[PDB]
């Protein structure tokens, strides 16, 4: 049984469009992504390209900013899937991301259907980055650790919130942490599911298109919900 009407929009393969306009330490960049999401299997695959030349930041720092609707919620947890319940009208996803001993991103995204396409349209601003740090200096490995993100209800805002740390492998040993502070709120007025506390388990793969000459990232994400 479908617990929310929005759940029905994800039974098949859903086309995805991602658009990001960024500005980090004054360096402007634009990223466009296309792919598809398969919530039955908790999976999404996208190819992202820079339309503005070589990116001023590493692709791994953009992974979390560049689609929680595609997580697989097990049958006993369908009542906790806020993300699909907010569809098709969608939700706003806002974050602050603080990089350990470095600058920070502020992001605001709208995730919603435009026609039959799930669109993620993002503005990102980055401030206070070190010229020779791991971000502006491109010192992060091209991979992504698995992370469990604790999701809680934000009842006053009729949405969800999360705070979590990602760990980014630094070239030649060590890890750099990124503290994420996240709030999601529905765009429409229709009723949404507010979840009990639970976790989303993420696993990600970063790859390249051998025929793409522009700066780019191919991303696979596999995400499942688990109760406590």
Residue numbers in the entry: -1 to 64, 68 to 229
Reported in the publication:
Using structure-guided engineering, we conferred the NaOH resistance that we first identified in FOLD6 into hfYFP and enhanced hfYFP’s monomericity in one step, producing mhYFP whose spectral properties are identical to hfYFP’s. hfYFP and FOLD6 have potential to serve similar functions as sfGFP, such as multiple epitope tag insertion, extremophile research, bimolecular fluorescence complementation, sensor stabilization, circular permutation and random mutagenesis.
Each FP crystallized as a monomer with no asymmetric unit.
